[PDB]
Design goal:
about 325 residues, alpha+beta, 9 helices, 19 strands, about 25% helix, elongated, binds the ligand O=C(N/N=C/c1ccc[nH]1)c1cc(O)c(O)c(O)c1, binds chloride ion, binds zinc ion, hydrolase, Hydrazone
Length: about 325
């Protein structure tokens, strides 16, 4: 007896492609690598309950290649497999609402993702790939599994791998529309004079070296090619936020002077992030956990600030 069922294949879970599969052969023998809501069914034969269901496959014809690129803005051949592998885990995570924001219950070293997700919900940012647009909308509503799996895939991190928040934000920002963002800096050395530089896009909203936006405006000390220490300060800023990052160090966060921040306790190869948000008071969100305080001091590694347009007064 020959037995078949109808299923649909997809790369973006929107555009469906009708298929007829032989129930005596595995999905892999018929489609190549195949996934059912994240689960790898490549070595599995069709079941009756599969009729009418949607399966992800790899982009193995030109139609799927175009659909995949338009949705994800990547042509990495291993992307869909990494996204599905992550999703099979992230769909089992829990996403509690904590102080009005979608968080993530701790699992699989996902603290860096929780902090990143909580941060995104407090800054003005639009994603460019439809995959991220669609999944971020769902994440804001509380169903963040597909968004978290996409972050992992885009960042080339597997579930359980230790992650860095600054690096993760850099990747997400690279897939965001920051074309309107502009930064002008000036650098003064007593021996070499001045040099002004203009930064755009991701480099216009991120800085590595100090956590304090105010000190960035007053001036920070850096090396120069001659051997002297030069001073760098912010001349002009056009962006809806800025992100200031530094190696973790004890730092005091004062209510009302920042938007949110990331706290890291541990060492290079192992640690834990928490999220601090400045609202009516200071709330510390640690996955599902919530505490509050009027003051905060801790090992801070990233601080986010509101912005619109800033121009210096330094002459
Ligand atoms: O993140 C930064 N660049 N990102 C690059 C990238 C490519 C793909 C993913 N990320 C970055 C670079 C700098 O030179 C900074 O001075 C800085 O603050 C940030
Ligand atoms: Cl978006
Ligand atoms: Zn110099």
């Amino acid at each position: 007896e020959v037995r078949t069922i109808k299923v649909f294949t997809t790369v973006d879970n929107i555009n469906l492609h009708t298929q007829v599969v032989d129930m005596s052969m595995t999905y892999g023998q018929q489609f190549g690598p195949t996934y059912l809501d994240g689960a790898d069914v490549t070595k599995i034969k069709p079941h009756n309950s599969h009729e009418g269901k949607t399966f992800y496959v790899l982009p193995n014809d030109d139609t799927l290649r175009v659909e995949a690129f338009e949705y994800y803005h990547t042509t990495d051949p291993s992307f869909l497999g990494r996204y599905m592998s992550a999703l099979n885990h992230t769909k089992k995570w829990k996403y509690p609402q904590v102080n009005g924001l979608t968080s993530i219950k701790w699992a699989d070293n996902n603290c860096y993702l929780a902090t990143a997700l909580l941060t995104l919900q407090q800054i003005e940012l639009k994603f460019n790939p439809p995959a991220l647009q669609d999944a971020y909308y769902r994440a804001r509503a509380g169903e963040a599994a597909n968004f978290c799996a996409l972050i992992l895939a885009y960042c080339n991190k597997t579930v359980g791998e230790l992650g860095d928040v600054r690096e993760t934000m850099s990747y997400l920002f690279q897939h965001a529309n920051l074309d309107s963002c502009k930064r002008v800096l000036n650098v003064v050395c007593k021996t070499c004079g001045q040099q002004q530089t203009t930064l755009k896009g991701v480099e216009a909203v991120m800085y590595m070296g100090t956590l304090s936006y105010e000190q960035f405006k007053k001036g920070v000390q850096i090396p120069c090619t001659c051997g002297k220490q030069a001073t760098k300060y912010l001349v002009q800023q056009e962006s809806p936020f800025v992100m200031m990052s530094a190696p973790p160090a004890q730092y005091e966060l004062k209510h009302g002077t920042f938007t949110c921040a990331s706290e890291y306790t541990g060492n290079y190869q192992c640690g834990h992030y928490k999220h601090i948000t400045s609202k009516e008071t200071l709330y510390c969100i640690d996955g599902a956990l919530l505490t509050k305080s009027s003051e905060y001091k801790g090992p801070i590694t990233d601080v986010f600030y509101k912005e619109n347009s800033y121009t210096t007064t330094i002459k």
